[PDB]
Amino acid sequence: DPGCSELIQASSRITTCSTEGVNTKCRLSGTALIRAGSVGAEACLMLKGVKEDQ
Amino acid sequence: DPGCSELIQASSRITTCSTEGVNTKCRLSGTALIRAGSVGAEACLMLKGVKEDQ
């Protein structure tokens, strides 16, 4: 029953990617601010690589 | 002075890509329809690879 609630997109400043032999291996380095959920909610933070399905 | 006018992106159904060492080339094999430009304008077609700079 519990699930995501606050959905925000991460910036590209703390998100980098590099493909080596058809293999999207992204790296994450930096700080990010997100709002916490209530009782039963979640503070989800999805990641967007080089494409849409990833 | 005139340049690109009707600029759209190609579909991923007839456009494939592959990475072979820092150089990610893309193939083009298919048929696509686009609106023809006016007198002087161009019918440019944007091609997106695997990232944003490509």
**Alpha-carbon gap, residue A8 to B36, rounded angstroms:** 39
Resolution in A: 13.3
What would the DSSP string read from start to end of A1-54? Answer: --EE----PPPSSSEE--BSSS-B--EE-S--------TTEE-------SSS--
**Alpha-carbon gap, residue A25 to A53, rounded angstroms:** 14
Method: cryo-EM
Using the Cβ of A16 and the Cβ atoms of chain B, whether some distance falls under 8 Å is answered with no
Q: Which chain B residues are closer than 8 Å to A19 by Cβ? A: 19, 24, 50
Tokens at residue A4, please?
């995501």
